[PDB]
Amino acid sequence: MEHVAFGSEDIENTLAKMDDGQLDGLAFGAIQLDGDGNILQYNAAEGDITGRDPKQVIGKNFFKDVAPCTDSPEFYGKFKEGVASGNLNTMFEYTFDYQMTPTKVKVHMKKALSGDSYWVFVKRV
Numbered sequence: 001m002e003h004v005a006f007g008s009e010d011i012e013n014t015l016a017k018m019d020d021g022q023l024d025g026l027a028f029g030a031i032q033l034d035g036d037g038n039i040l041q042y043n044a045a046e047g048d049i050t051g052r053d054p055k056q057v058i059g060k061n062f063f064k065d066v067a068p069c070t071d072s073p074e075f076y077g078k079f080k081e082g083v084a085s086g087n088l089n090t091m092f093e094y095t096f097d098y099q100m101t102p103t104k105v106k107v108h109m110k111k112a113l114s115g116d117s118y119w120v121f122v123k124r125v
Contacts, residue, residue, distance in 0.1 A: 078090055087111055
């Protein structure tokens with residue numbers, strides 16, 4: 001698999017080199033979002049946690065379409081304050097419960113080395 005630890009201080013440098021294929025070798029869920037929350041990349045481990053098919057959710061809006069349970073001040077609110085600011089680095093526990101067995105996760109959101117893109121990293125707790 002691809003050798004990077006969840007929560008590493010330089011994760012955004014490591015992931016800058018990865019295409020879709022390599023992203024699927026990570027030990028944790030990874031989603032790349034634009035500044036509006038649209039999904040640009042979604043890896044296999046994320047699909048394993050949530051049941052979503054990665055190919056199919058690319059292009060959908062994470063907050064409006066895919067993950068309405070995250071449309072709250074505690075998740076989306078943190079994201080949109082990060083985008084507006086141009087900096088984002090926060091880690092918190094959350095429960096994902098939309099059309100799925102409720103599943104408790106650790107979430108890490110971090111601004112990418114790109115441009116106007118943002119990472120959401122997910123693992124089970």
